Amino acid sequence: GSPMETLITAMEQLYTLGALDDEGLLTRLGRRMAEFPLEPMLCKMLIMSVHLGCSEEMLTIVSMLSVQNVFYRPKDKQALADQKKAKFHQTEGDHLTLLAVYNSWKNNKFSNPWCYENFIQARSLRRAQDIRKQMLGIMDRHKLDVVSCGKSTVRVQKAICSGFFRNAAKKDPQEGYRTLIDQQVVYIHPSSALFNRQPEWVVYHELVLTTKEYMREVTTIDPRWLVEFAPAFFKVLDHGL
Amino acid sequence: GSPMETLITAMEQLYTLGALDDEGLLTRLGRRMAEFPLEPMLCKMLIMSVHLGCSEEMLTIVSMLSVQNVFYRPKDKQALADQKKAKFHQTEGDHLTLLAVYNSWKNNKFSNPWCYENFIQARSLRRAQDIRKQMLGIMDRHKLDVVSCGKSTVRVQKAICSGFFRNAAKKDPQEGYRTLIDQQVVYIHPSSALFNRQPEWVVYHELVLTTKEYMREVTTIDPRWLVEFAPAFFKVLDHGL
Ligand SMILES: [Br-]
Ligand SMILES: [Br-]
Ligand SMILES: [Br-]
Ligand SMILES: [Br-]
Ligand SMILES: [Br-]
Ligand SMILES: [Br-]
């Protein structure tokens, strides 16, 4: 709400992400993050994916998160659109579902008819593709290794967690989820890949208030990853686990 | 042009202003600055005006800088509008001219007819007045002393310099001014109180490119003040004086 306030908040975020050290200087991680034109949590998870051996997947995920409407859901074809979407649904959640969508598009030869059949916006995937190429070019310039996790997608989940631990939520016994940061009651959106399999712990990309305070893009986590990637930030009960 | 880049730049600014120490922690100055909803250079000069004994004037100046069109200049009354404006012109420049305008408005009983006579936008002064009251309320909450410099307006110039040293410019022998920060050729606007008395050294509020790269709101400085208020930032030849 004021230049100084938001600057201080952003500085604190950088420290917790590992971008700044105890003396407030940029770390190697911070320097690398700074080369990308993304918001800091996205930069963090991209760099970490290099260390976690899943930068091939993360480049795609980051690009998919940077575009708007990937799926469309016509009023008269809702069950069909949901059926086609659910085929992409991954058990680990929304980020890996976005990866699945992009990879399928690629494997089906970047086909507009295929996008139409599956209720996917071809224009959004094309923009995602452009962004990915840009991000890959930055990776290559600064010798940041691009590798795939293959079937070991737990490494993708961990990388997301290393960036978005601040957005951790634990399932509430009575209703929805409670955020760890300030105990806000939040919910998994009906469109989420996790809506019918709501796990104990998640991180979310962002919060959006519509019908309820909804989490947008949720990924399943192990609570121990919070301590692994943000050991100063969490207490084995700051915020309890 | 990217979240990380602009954040790093803003952090560097805070350090040079004295808002952050060598370990990147908020100083007493930084903590005080953070209570105001202004851009950091404005916050700096407001806090410093407390130490320099001119916070009465600075509250007014900061409020006047926070509003849009104070003077108006009708096409058919240009010489008259300029004549009425020049009556407010202070030898030290634009910031002290803004102070003179507000104080005269007050001394003439906040009169709309008076504003009309002098080609001043009454609505802009009213908004400036509202902002001043808000800023004064923040000063009072945190026990930041409000005092006047009286006739010793050099203290106002020094306070401006302590905040805006980054925007220092030295007069170029051949044409206009050269900024100290990156040697950009810049000019005093025809509307400035300093246009017909262009001094050796100035600081400016901002740069605006119109007909030329124009400095907007210039105040005369002594180059020694740059060393006084930013001793690590300037060389007695970083940037030469
Ligand atoms: Br690193
Ligand atoms: Br983000
Ligand atoms: Br888009
Ligand atoms: Br102070
Ligand atoms: Br400013
Ligand atoms: Br205004």
Coordinates of C-alpha atoms and ligand atoms in Angstrom, one line a residue:
Chain A
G1 CA 0.0 0.0 0.0
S2 CA 3.1 2.2 0.1
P3 CA 6.5 2.0 -1.8
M4 CA 8.6 1.5 1.4
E5 CA 6.2 -1.2 2.9
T6 CA 6.1 -3.3 -0.3
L7 CA 9.8 -3.0 -0.8
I8 CA 10.6 -4.2 2.7
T9 CA 8.1 -7.1 2.2
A10 CA 9.8 -8.0 -1.1
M11 CA 13.3 -7.9 0.6
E12 CA 12.1 -10.3 3.4
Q13 CA 10.7 -12.7 0.7
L14 CA 14.1 -12.7 -1.1
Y15 CA 15.9 -13.5 2.2
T16 CA 13.5 -16.4 2.9
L17 CA 13.9 -17.7 -0.6
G18 CA 17.7 -17.8 -0.2
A19 CA 18.3 -15.0 -2.8
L20 CA 19.9 -12.9 -0.1
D21 CA 22.3 -13.9 2.7
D22 CA 22.6 -12.8 6.3
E23 CA 24.4 -9.6 5.3
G24 CA 21.8 -8.8 2.7
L25 CA 24.0 -9.5 -0.3
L26 CA 22.9 -11.5 -3.4
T27 CA 23.8 -15.1 -3.3
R28 CA 24.7 -17.3 -6.3
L29 CA 21.0 -18.4 -6.2
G30 CA 19.9 -14.8 -6.1
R31 CA 22.2 -13.8 -9.0
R32 CA 20.9 -16.7 -11.1
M33 CA 17.2 -15.9 -10.2
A34 CA 17.8 -12.2 -11.3
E35 CA 18.5 -13.3 -14.9
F36 CA 14.9 -14.3 -15.3
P37 CA 12.0 -11.9 -15.9
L38 CA 9.6 -13.9 -13.6
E39 CA 8.3 -13.2 -10.1
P40 CA 10.8 -14.3 -7.4
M41 CA 9.1 -17.5 -6.3
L42 CA 9.0 -18.7 -9.9
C43 CA 12.7 -17.8 -10.4
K44 CA 13.5 -19.8 -7.2
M45 CA 11.7 -22.9 -8.4
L46 CA 13.3 -22.7 -11.8
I47 CA 16.9 -22.5 -10.4
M48 CA 16.2 -25.2 -7.9
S49 CA 14.9 -27.5 -10.7
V50 CA 18.5 -27.4 -12.1
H51 CA 19.8 -28.8 -8.8
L52 CA 16.8 -31.2 -8.5
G53 CA 17.3 -32.5 -12.0
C54 CA 13.9 -31.5 -13.5
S55 CA 14.6 -28.2 -15.3
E56 CA 13.1 -29.7 -18.5
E57 CA 9.7 -30.0 -16.8
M58 CA 10.1 -26.8 -14.8
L59 CA 10.7 -24.6 -17.9
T60 CA 7.4 -26.0 -19.3
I61 CA 5.6 -25.5 -16.0
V62 CA 6.8 -21.9 -15.5
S63 CA 5.8 -21.1 -19.1
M64 CA 2.3 -22.7 -18.6
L65 CA 1.9 -20.6 -15.4
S66 CA 2.7 -17.5 -17.4
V67 CA -0.3 -17.7 -19.7
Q68 CA -4.0 -17.2 -19.1
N69 CA -6.8 -19.6 -20.2
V70 CA -5.4 -22.9 -21.2
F71 CA -8.7 -24.9 -20.9
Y72 CA -12.0 -23.7 -22.1
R73 CA -15.4 -25.0 -20.9
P74 CA -18.4 -24.3 -23.1
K75 CA -21.7 -24.2 -21.2
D76 CA -23.2 -27.0 -23.4
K77 CA -20.1 -29.2 -23.4
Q78 CA -19.2 -29.0 -19.7
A79 CA -19.2 -32.8 -18.9
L80 CA -17.2 -33.5 -22.1
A81 CA -14.7 -30.6 -21.5
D82 CA -14.2 -31.9 -18.0
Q83 CA -13.8 -35.4 -19.3
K84 CA -11.2 -34.4 -21.8
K85 CA -9.4 -32.3 -19.1
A86 CA -9.5 -35.2 -16.5
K87 CA -7.5 -37.3 -19.0
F88 CA -4.6 -34.8 -18.3
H89 CA -5.1 -34.9 -14.5
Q90 CA -2.1 -36.0 -12.6
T91 CA -2.4 -37.4 -9.1
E92 CA 0.2 -34.9 -7.8
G93 CA -1.9 -31.9 -8.8
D94 CA -2.2 -28.9 -11.1
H95 CA 1.4 -28.0 -11.9
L96 CA 2.1 -31.6 -13.2
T97 CA -1.3 -31.4 -15.0
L98 CA -0.1 -28.3 -16.9
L99 CA 3.1 -30.2 -17.8
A100 CA 0.9 -33.1 -19.0
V101 CA -1.1 -30.8 -21.2
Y102 CA 1.9 -29.2 -22.9
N103 CA 3.7 -32.5 -23.5
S104 CA 0.6 -34.1 -25.0
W105 CA 0.2 -31.1 -27.3
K106 CA 3.8 -31.5 -28.4
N107 CA 3.4 -35.3 -28.8
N108 CA 0.3 -34.7 -30.9
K109 CA 2.4 -32.5 -33.3
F110 CA 1.2 -29.1 -32.1
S111 CA -2.2 -29.7 -33.8
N112 CA -4.9 -27.1 -33.7
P113 CA -7.6 -29.7 -34.4
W114 CA -6.2 -31.7 -31.4
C115 CA -6.6 -28.6 -29.3
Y116 CA -10.2 -28.2 -30.4
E117 CA -10.9 -31.8 -29.6
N118 CA -9.5 -31.5 -26.1
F119 CA -11.0 -28.1 -25.3
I120 CA -7.6 -26.5 -25.1
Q121 CA -6.8 -22.9 -26.3
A122 CA -4.1 -23.3 -29.0
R123 CA -3.2 -19.6 -28.7
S124 CA -2.3 -20.0 -25.0
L125 CA -0.1 -23.0 -25.7
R126 CA 1.7 -21.1 -28.5
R127 CA 2.4 -18.2 -26.1
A128 CA 3.6 -20.8 -23.5
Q129 CA 5.8 -22.2 -26.2
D130 CA 7.3 -18.8 -27.0
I131 CA 7.9 -18.1 -23.3
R132 CA 9.6 -21.5 -22.9
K133 CA 12.0 -20.8 -25.7
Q134 CA 12.9 -17.4 -24.1
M135 CA 13.5 -19.0 -20.7
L136 CA 15.5 -21.8 -22.3
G137 CA 17.7 -19.2 -24.0
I138 CA 18.4 -17.6 -20.7
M139 CA 19.3 -21.0 -19.2
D140 CA 21.7 -21.7 -22.0
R141 CA 23.4 -18.2 -21.8
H142 CA 24.3 -18.7 -18.2
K143 CA 25.1 -22.5 -18.4
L144 CA 22.2 -23.6 -16.3
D145 CA 21.7 -27.3 -17.1
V146 CA 18.5 -28.5 -18.6
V147 CA 17.6 -32.1 -17.6
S148 CA 14.4 -34.2 -17.3
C149 CA 13.2 -36.1 -14.2
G150 CA 11.7 -38.7 -16.4
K151 CA 9.3 -40.7 -14.2
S152 CA 10.7 -39.3 -11.0
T153 CA 8.2 -36.4 -10.8
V154 CA 8.6 -36.1 -7.0
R155 CA 11.6 -33.9 -8.0
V156 CA 9.2 -31.5 -9.7
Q157 CA 7.0 -31.3 -6.6
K158 CA 10.0 -30.6 -4.4
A159 CA 11.2 -27.9 -6.7
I160 CA 7.8 -26.2 -6.6
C161 CA 7.8 -26.5 -2.8
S162 CA 11.3 -24.8 -2.7
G163 CA 9.8 -21.8 -4.4
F164 CA 6.3 -21.7 -3.0
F165 CA 6.7 -23.0 0.6
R166 CA 5.2 -19.6 1.7
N167 CA 2.0 -20.8 0.1
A168 CA 1.7 -24.0 2.1
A169 CA -1.7 -25.1 3.3
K170 CA -2.8 -28.1 5.6
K171 CA -6.2 -29.7 5.2
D172 CA -8.7 -28.6 7.9
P173 CA -10.6 -31.5 9.6
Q174 CA -13.9 -29.6 9.3
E175 CA -13.7 -27.5 6.1
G176 CA -11.2 -26.8 3.4
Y177 CA -7.6 -25.8 4.2
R178 CA -5.7 -23.4 6.5
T179 CA -2.7 -21.5 5.1
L180 CA 0.4 -21.8 7.3
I181 CA 1.3 -18.1 6.8
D182 CA -1.7 -16.5 8.6
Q183 CA -4.3 -19.3 9.2
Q184 CA -6.6 -18.2 6.4
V185 CA -9.4 -20.7 5.5
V186 CA -8.9 -21.6 1.8
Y187 CA -10.4 -24.1 -0.7
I188 CA -9.4 -26.3 -3.6
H189 CA -11.2 -25.1 -6.7
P190 CA -13.7 -27.5 -8.4
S191 CA -11.5 -27.3 -11.6
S192 CA -8.4 -28.5 -9.8
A193 CA -6.9 -31.9 -10.5
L194 CA -6.9 -32.3 -6.7
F195 CA -10.6 -31.5 -6.1
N196 CA -11.7 -35.2 -5.8
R197 CA -8.5 -36.3 -4.1
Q198 CA -7.7 -33.5 -1.5
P199 CA -4.5 -34.4 0.2
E200 CA -3.1 -33.5 3.7
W201 CA -0.6 -30.9 2.5
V202 CA -0.4 -28.6 -0.6
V203 CA 1.3 -25.5 -1.9
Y204 CA -0.7 -23.2 -4.1
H205 CA 0.4 -20.8 -6.9
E206 CA -2.0 -18.0 -5.8
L207 CA -5.2 -17.1 -3.9
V208 CA -8.3 -16.0 -5.8
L209 CA -11.5 -14.9 -4.1
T210 CA -14.6 -15.8 -6.1
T211 CA -17.4 -17.9 -4.6
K212 CA -14.9 -18.7 -1.8
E213 CA -11.2 -17.9 -1.0
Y214 CA -9.9 -20.4 -3.6
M215 CA -6.4 -21.7 -4.0
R216 CA -5.3 -21.6 -7.7
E217 CA -3.0 -24.3 -9.0
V218 CA -2.3 -26.7 -6.1
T219 CA 0.5 -29.3 -5.8
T220 CA 0.7 -32.1 -3.2
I221 CA 3.6 -31.9 -0.8
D222 CA 5.3 -33.8 2.0
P223 CA 5.4 -31.4 5.1
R224 CA 9.1 -32.4 5.6
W225 CA 10.0 -30.6 2.3
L226 CA 9.0 -27.3 4.0
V227 CA 11.8 -27.9 6.6
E228 CA 14.2 -29.2 3.9
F229 CA 13.8 -26.1 1.7
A230 CA 13.0 -23.4 4.3
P231 CA 14.6 -24.8 7.6
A232 CA 14.7 -21.3 9.2
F233 CA 11.1 -20.5 8.2
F234 CA 9.4 -23.5 9.8
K235 CA 9.2 -25.0 13.3
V236 CA 8.8 -28.8 13.9
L237 CA 5.7 -28.2 16.1
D238 CA 7.9 -19.8 13.0
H239 CA 5.0 -21.8 11.5
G240 CA 4.1 -25.3 12.8
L241 CA 4.1 -28.5 10.8
Chain B
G1 CA 11.9 -4.5 -16.8
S2 CA 11.7 -7.5 -14.5
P3 CA 10.6 -8.0 -10.9
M4 CA 14.1 -9.1 -9.7
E5 CA 16.0 -6.3 -11.5
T6 CA 13.8 -3.5 -10.2
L7 CA 13.9 -5.0 -6.7
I8 CA 17.7 -5.1 -6.6
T9 CA 17.8 -1.5 -8.0
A10 CA 15.4 -0.4 -5.2
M11 CA 17.4 -2.1 -2.5
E12 CA 20.6 -0.3 -3.8
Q13 CA 18.7 3.0 -3.6
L14 CA 17.7 2.3 0.0
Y15 CA 21.3 1.6 1.0
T16 CA 22.6 4.8 -0.6
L17 CA 19.8 6.8 1.1
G18 CA 20.9 5.5 4.5
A19 CA 17.7 3.5 4.9
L20 CA 19.7 0.2 5.1
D21 CA 23.0 -0.4 6.9
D22 CA 26.0 -2.5 5.8
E23 CA 24.3 -5.7 6.9
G24 CA 21.1 -4.8 5.0
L25 CA 19.0 -4.1 8.1
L26 CA 16.7 -1.2 8.4
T27 CA 18.2 1.8 10.2
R28 CA 16.4 4.3 12.4
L29 CA 16.1 6.5 9.4
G30 CA 14.8 3.6 7.3
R31 CA 12.2 2.7 10.0
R32 CA 11.0 6.3 10.1
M33 CA 10.9 6.6 6.2
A34 CA 8.8 3.4 6.1
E35 CA 5.9 5.1 8.0
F36 CA 5.2 7.4 5.1
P37 CA 3.4 6.4 1.9
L38 CA 5.8 8.4 -0.4
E39 CA 8.6 7.3 -2.8
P40 CA 11.8 6.7 -0.9
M41 CA 13.7 9.8 -1.9
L42 CA 10.7 11.9 -0.7
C43 CA 10.6 9.9 2.6
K44 CA 14.4 10.6 3.1
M45 CA 14.1 14.4 2.6
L46 CA 11.1 14.5 5.0
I47 CA 12.9 12.7 7.8
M48 CA 16.1 14.7 7.2
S49 CA 14.1 18.0 7.4
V50 CA 13.4 17.0 11.0
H51 CA 17.2 16.9 11.7
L52 CA 17.8 20.0 9.6
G53 CA 15.0 22.0 11.3
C54 CA 12.8 22.7 8.3
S55 CA 10.0 20.0 8.6
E56 CA 7.3 22.7 8.5
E57 CA 8.5 23.7 5.0
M58 CA 9.2 20.1 3.9
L59 CA 5.7 18.8 4.7
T60 CA 4.4 21.5 2.4
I61 CA 6.9 20.9 -0.3
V62 CA 6.3 17.1 -0.2
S63 CA 2.6 17.7 -0.4
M64 CA 3.0 20.2 -3.3
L65 CA 5.1 17.6 -5.2
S66 CA 2.4 15.0 -4.7
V67 CA -0.2 17.0 -6.8
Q68 CA -0.5 17.6 -10.6
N69 CA -1.2 21.0 -12.2
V70 CA -0.7 23.8 -9.7
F71 CA -0.3 26.6 -12.2
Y72 CA -2.4 27.0 -15.3
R73 CA -1.4 29.0 -18.4
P74 CA -4.2 30.0 -20.8
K75 CA -3.0 30.6 -24.4
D76 CA -4.4 34.1 -24.4
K77 CA -3.1 35.1 -20.9
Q78 CA 0.5 33.6 -21.1
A79 CA 2.4 36.8 -20.3
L80 CA 0.0 37.6 -17.5
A81 CA 0.1 34.0 -16.1
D82 CA 3.9 34.0 -16.3
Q83 CA 4.0 37.4 -14.6
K84 CA 1.7 36.2 -11.7
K85 CA 3.8 33.0 -11.4
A86 CA 7.2 34.9 -11.4
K87 CA 6.0 36.7 -8.3
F88 CA 6.2 33.4 -6.5
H89 CA 9.6 32.6 -8.0
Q90 CA 12.4 32.0 -5.4
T91 CA 16.0 32.5 -6.3
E92 CA 16.8 29.0 -4.9
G93 CA 14.5 27.3 -7.4
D94 CA 11.3 25.3 -7.9
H95 CA 10.8 23.5 -4.5
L96 CA 11.0 26.8 -2.6
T97 CA 8.7 28.3 -5.3
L98 CA 6.1 25.6 -4.5
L99 CA 6.4 26.4 -0.8
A100 CA 5.9 30.1 -1.6
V101 CA 2.7 29.4 -3.6
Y102 CA 1.2 27.3 -0.8
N103 CA 2.1 29.8 1.9
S104 CA 0.7 32.7 -0.1
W105 CA -2.6 30.8 -0.6
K106 CA -2.8 30.3 3.1
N107 CA -1.9 33.9 3.9
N108 CA -4.6 35.1 1.5
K109 CA -7.2 33.0 3.4
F110 CA -7.4 30.0 1.0
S111 CA -9.4 32.1 -1.4
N112 CA -10.7 30.7 -4.7
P113 CA -10.9 34.2 -6.3
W114 CA -7.2 34.7 -5.2
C115 CA -6.4 31.4 -7.0
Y116 CA -8.2 32.6 -10.1
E117 CA -6.3 36.0 -10.0
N118 CA -3.0 34.3 -9.8
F119 CA -3.6 31.5 -12.3
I120 CA -3.4 28.8 -9.7
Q121 CA -5.6 25.6 -9.6
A122 CA -7.5 25.8 -6.3
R123 CA -8.4 22.1 -6.5
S124 CA -4.7 21.1 -6.6
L125 CA -3.9 23.2 -3.5
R126 CA -6.8 21.7 -1.6
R127 CA -5.5 18.2 -2.4
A128 CA -2.0 19.4 -1.3
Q129 CA -3.6 20.6 1.9
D130 CA -5.3 17.2 2.5
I131 CA -2.0 15.4 1.9
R132 CA -0.1 17.8 4.2
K133 CA -2.6 17.1 7.1
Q134 CA -2.1 13.3 6.5
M135 CA 1.7 13.6 6.5
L136 CA 1.6 15.8 9.6
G137 CA -0.6 13.2 11.4
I138 CA 2.1 10.6 10.7
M139 CA 4.8 13.0 12.0
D140 CA 2.8 13.5 15.2
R141 CA 2.1 9.8 15.8
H142 CA 5.8 8.9 15.7
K143 CA 7.0 12.1 17.6
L144 CA 8.8 13.5 14.6
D145 CA 9.4 17.2 15.4
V146 CA 7.8 19.8 13.1
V147 CA 9.8 23.1 13.0
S148 CA 10.3 26.0 10.6
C149 CA 13.6 27.2 9.1
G150 CA 12.2 30.8 9.0
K151 CA 14.4 32.8 6.8
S152 CA 17.2 30.1 6.8
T153 CA 15.9 28.3 3.7
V154 CA 19.4 26.9 2.9
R155 CA 18.3 24.1 5.3
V156 CA 15.4 23.3 2.9
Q157 CA 17.9 23.1 0.0
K158 CA 20.1 20.8 2.0
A159 CA 17.2 18.5 3.0
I160 CA 16.2 18.2 -0.7
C161 CA 19.8 17.4 -1.6
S162 CA 20.0 14.7 1.1
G163 CA 17.1 12.9 -0.6
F164 CA 17.7 13.7 -4.3
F165 CA 21.6 13.7 -4.5
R166 CA 21.1 10.9 -7.1
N167 CA 19.5 13.5 -9.3
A168 CA 22.4 15.9 -9.3
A169 CA 23.3 17.8 -12.4
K170 CA 26.2 20.2 -13.2
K171 CA 25.9 22.9 -15.8
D172 CA 27.6 22.1 -19.1
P173 CA 29.8 24.8 -20.6
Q174 CA 28.3 24.4 -24.1
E175 CA 24.6 23.4 -23.6
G176 CA 22.3 22.5 -20.7
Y177 CA 23.3 20.2 -17.9
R178 CA 25.0 16.8 -17.5
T179 CA 23.6 14.4 -14.9
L180 CA 26.2 13.0 -12.5
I181 CA 24.6 9.5 -12.5
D182 CA 25.2 8.6 -16.2
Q183 CA 26.3 11.9 -18.0
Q184 CA 22.9 12.4 -19.7
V185 CA 22.4 15.9 -21.3
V186 CA 19.4 17.5 -19.6
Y187 CA 17.8 21.0 -19.6
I188 CA 16.0 23.4 -17.2
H189 CA 12.4 23.8 -18.5
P190 CA 11.2 27.3 -19.6
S191 CA 8.6 27.2 -16.8
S192 CA 11.2 26.7 -14.0
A193 CA 12.0 29.5 -11.5
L194 CA 15.7 28.8 -12.5
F195 CA 15.3 29.1 -16.3
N196 CA 16.7 32.7 -16.4
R197 CA 19.2 32.2 -13.6
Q198 CA 20.7 28.7 -14.4
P199 CA 23.2 27.9 -11.6
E200 CA 26.3 25.7 -11.6
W201 CA 24.8 22.8 -9.6
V202 CA 21.2 21.6 -9.2
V203 CA 19.2 18.5 -8.1
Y204 CA 16.0 17.7 -9.9
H205 CA 12.8 15.9 -8.8
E206 CA 12.4 13.9 -12.1
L207 CA 13.3 13.8 -15.8
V208 CA 10.6 14.3 -18.4
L209 CA 11.3 14.0 -22.2
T210 CA 9.1 16.4 -24.2
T211 CA 10.8 18.9 -26.6
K212 CA 14.1 18.0 -24.9
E213 CA 15.2 15.8 -22.0
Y214 CA 13.9 18.3 -19.4
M215 CA 14.6 18.3 -15.6
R216 CA 11.3 18.9 -13.7
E217 CA 11.5 20.8 -10.4
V218 CA 15.1 22.0 -9.9
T219 CA 16.7 23.3 -6.7
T220 CA 20.1 25.0 -6.5
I221 CA 22.8 23.1 -4.5
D222 CA 26.3 23.5 -3.3
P223 CA 28.3 20.5 -4.6
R224 CA 29.8 20.0 -1.1
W225 CA 26.3 19.0 0.1
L226 CA 26.6 15.9 -2.1
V227 CA 29.6 14.8 -0.1
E228 CA 28.0 15.8 3.2
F229 CA 24.8 13.7 2.6
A230 CA 26.2 10.9 0.4
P231 CA 29.9 10.7 1.3
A232 CA 30.3 7.1 0.1
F233 CA 28.5 7.9 -3.2
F234 CA 30.6 10.8 -4.4
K235 CA 34.3 11.2 -5.2
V236 CA 36.2 14.5 -4.6
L237 CA 37.4 14.5 -8.3
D238 CA 32.1 7.1 -7.6
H239 CA 30.9 10.3 -9.4
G240 CA 33.1 13.3 -9.6
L241 CA 32.4 16.8 -8.2
Ligands
BR1 BR 22.3 -21.8 -7.2
BR2 BR 4.6 -15.9 -8.4
BR3 BR -2.3 -16.2 -22.7
BR4 BR 16.6 9.4 11.7
BR5 BR 10.4 10.5 -5.9
BR6 BR -3.9 17.0 -8.3

